[PDB]
């Protein structure tokens, strides 16, 4: 128990001053309207997640319906509809190459779909397993490698063709509910019940950094586009942000008005705008520097399930729980 | 815009298929299982099943560490909580009941309670008065949407209870109760 004591003493001794003092002298953003510019309907149940492609035009969304569908966002057309075998999928993905889709959830098995088949009908390219808990996120690392985070307190890296997990990650104690990977695809962070966001190196294979600034559980996380920080949302209505080199928490976007938890968070291309989604029928938008609300995004009537920015930052899509996708701008 | 027109037509075809699947889906009246039960359903791995009785479809969701995926089961017609009270573990079942009640997102989703495996209780064993007393203890704990207790064909019970739940919900929608 002495080792952790001296570790925490050294960590607290390496902090001199906060960035709040150095930020109050900077120009703020004022207000952003961010009115709906497009809507997507055709689902029959609550959308659970969605993820833009690397081209920032196509998107894929899955719901409790039992089918995940791929929209061409510019013209609202349904490019594809995939009739999922199991009705319980709690995540999505869209490979950077743009050829494969991913799904998983209570089925305990991850499914990889191949869009660019010889025929015009998609199929399960690879139904790969090896997890004893429900899957939270299945982000695509590359064409043939996928990183998954299951509820068994461990997260895995899977080789698509072979099937077996190349690398395991067993550093946690609770179930990881949210996994995100850096744009450089070299590191990735996750959070679980134990309220400890862990940063992992893909090649190292075991935990590189840990953060314990929260209380209840890290129920949503996302990465900074620069690649040296990440912001998370918990059940404490807290949007605590952490850096990487300093290993210490920077500042908190906490408002006592919200008592419920968070659903998802996301940044902008510049990074000086941290969108977020709450259970109180609204999407508050923060500012990652002044920590002051700069507007609201209220156009839904149920829980805002997953909100995500595009690669080029032209839009944000907020798949909600009322069978609707909304593409703002 | 020729290819655009053809893409629009294909999207319209996909939307027609989606409409047909919606017509199918709205007539399912899905159910959740919580907590023997294998005999009830037949007559880790989720054993989702489709069974039709009296020209009415039903979707059973067969399903211990408590997680958040219970919240996503918001639109279930009813939750059948099975309990083989052969006994400690009963108090764990009561704790699960309390967690379901306090989930704050399972509200307005009715829960049916089943006291099955009466043969096991009889072999373990007025004694009928004693089993009624332990049942009454279970309801007393259950006092802490409305729950439907059941103690002894079970498919008929769930049929009647689902009919009552949907009737009460539709009466609530039109302000008749």
């Amino acid at each position: 128990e002495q080792l952790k004591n001296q570790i925490r003493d050294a960590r607290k001794a390496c902090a001199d001053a906060t960035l709040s003092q150095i930020t109050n002298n900077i120009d703020p953003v004022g207000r952003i309207q961010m009115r709906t510019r497009r809507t997507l309907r055709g689902h029959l149940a609550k959308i659970y997640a969605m993820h833009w492609g690397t081209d920032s035009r196509l998107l894929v969304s899955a719901s409790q319906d039992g089918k995940l569908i791929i929209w061409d966002s510019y013209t609202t057309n349904k490019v594809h509809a995939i009739p999922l075998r199991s009705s319980w999928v709690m995540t999505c993905a869209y490979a950077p190459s743009g050829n494969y889709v991913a799904c998983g959830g209570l089925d305990n098995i991850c499914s990889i779909y191949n869009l660019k088949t010889r025929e015009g009908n998609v199929r399960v390219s690879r139904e790969l397993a090896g997890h004893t808990g429900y899957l939270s996120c299945c982000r695509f690392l590359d064409d043939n490698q996928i990183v998954t985070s299951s509820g068994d307190t461990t997260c895995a890296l899977w080789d698509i063709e072979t099937g077996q997990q190349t690398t395991t990650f067993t550093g946690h104690t609770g179930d990881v509910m949210s996994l995100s990977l850096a744009p450089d695809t070299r590191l990735f962070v996750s959070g679980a019940c134990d309220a400890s966001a862990k940063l992992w190196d893909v090649r190292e294979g075991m935990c590189r950094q840990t953060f314990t600034g929260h209380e209840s559980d890290i129920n949503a996380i996302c990465f900074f586009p620069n690649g040296n920080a990440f912001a998370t949302g918990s059940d404490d209505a807290t949007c605590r942000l952490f850096d990487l080199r300093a290993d210490q928490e920077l500042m908190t976007y906490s408002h006592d008005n919200i008592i419920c938890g968070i659903t998802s968070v996301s940044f902008s291309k510049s990074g000086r705008l941290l969108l977020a989604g709450y259970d109180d029928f609204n999407c508050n938008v923060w500012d990652a520097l002044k920590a002051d609300r700069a507007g609201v995004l209220a156009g839904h009537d149920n829980r805002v399930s997953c909100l995500g920015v595009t690669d080029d930052g032209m839009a944000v899509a907020t798949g909600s729980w009322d069978s609707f996708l909304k593409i703002w701008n | 815009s020729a290819e655009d027109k053809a893409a629009v037509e294909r999207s319209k075809m996909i939307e027609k298929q989606i409409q047909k699947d919606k017509q199918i889906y709205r007539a399912t009246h899905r159910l959740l299982l919580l907590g023997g039960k294998n005999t009830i359903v037949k007559q880790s791995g989720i054993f989702e099943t489709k069974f039709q009785v009296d020209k009415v479809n039903f979707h059973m969701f067969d399903v211990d560490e408590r997680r958040k995926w219970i919240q996503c089961f918001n639109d279930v017609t009813a939750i059948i909580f099975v309990t083989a009270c052969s006994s400690n573990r009963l108090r764990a079942s009561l704790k699960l009941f309390d967690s379901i009640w306090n989930n704050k997102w399972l509200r307005d989703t009715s829960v049916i309670l089943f006291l099955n495996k009466q043969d096991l209780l009889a072999e373990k064993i007025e004694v009928i008065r004693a089993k009624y007393f332990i049942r009454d203890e279970f309801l007393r704990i259950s006092t802490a949407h409305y729950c439907y207790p059941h103690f002894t064909e079970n498919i008929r019970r769930v049929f009647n209870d689902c009919r009552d739940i949907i009737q009460r919900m539709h009466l609530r929608q039109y302000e008749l109760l």
């Epitope: 035009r57 196509l58 061409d72 057309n77 490019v79 594809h80 743009g98 010889r118 025929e119 015009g120 009908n121 | 815009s1 020729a2 290819e3 655009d4 027109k5 053809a6 893409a7 037509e9 294909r10 075809m13």
Partner: single-chain antibody, 230 residues
Amino acid sequence: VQLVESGGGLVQPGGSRKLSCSASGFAFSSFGMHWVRQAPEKGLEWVAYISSGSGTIYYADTVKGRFTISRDDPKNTLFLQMTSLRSEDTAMYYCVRSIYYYGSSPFDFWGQGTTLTVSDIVMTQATSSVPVTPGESVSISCRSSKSLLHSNGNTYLYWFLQRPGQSPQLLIYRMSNLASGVPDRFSGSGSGTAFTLTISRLEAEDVGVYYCMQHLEYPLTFGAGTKLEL
């Protein structure tokens, strides 16, 4: 995947005949289809097209009143009906699949073909035969009467190089992209009014006749041709 065409023969003018296409290997219900006939000494010519659900059906403006076309998904067969034919319709036919969505590659596969015997947008393939030497870039040019650039930013032009003895193949779609089973040597370029296809390394399989094709307009006229010699 496989397309098999049946029918044809020799019939005196003013008659009728049914041609059939059996598709085996893919879910062709969600596949638009085209018929393209080629004269023994002329280039390919459009005939008719059917959508996925046989909802939208177009026809060749030259011959529309004497042609019938239909399809049966459960019977796995799409057929065409010719009536009151003339000496002009002495040509061998092709059965073509195509799928239409963002990122699709229409005219992906061409059927084997069966034989039969008895202004709007036009292109200009002025060149006919340009022999080349190994290890040298080969360029083939085509032109259009109206600019093929749309408001979306994609130019609807296709290339249909055909090997000497078999069905035509799809090489370049949408004026920039590349089909699935094509070597990287073939590359399309242009500006929007004059288009070209360039090959860096040439081999025996590269010998063929290259055809340019338009799609802004559903009549879908397609261009005249150019032989390759080695």
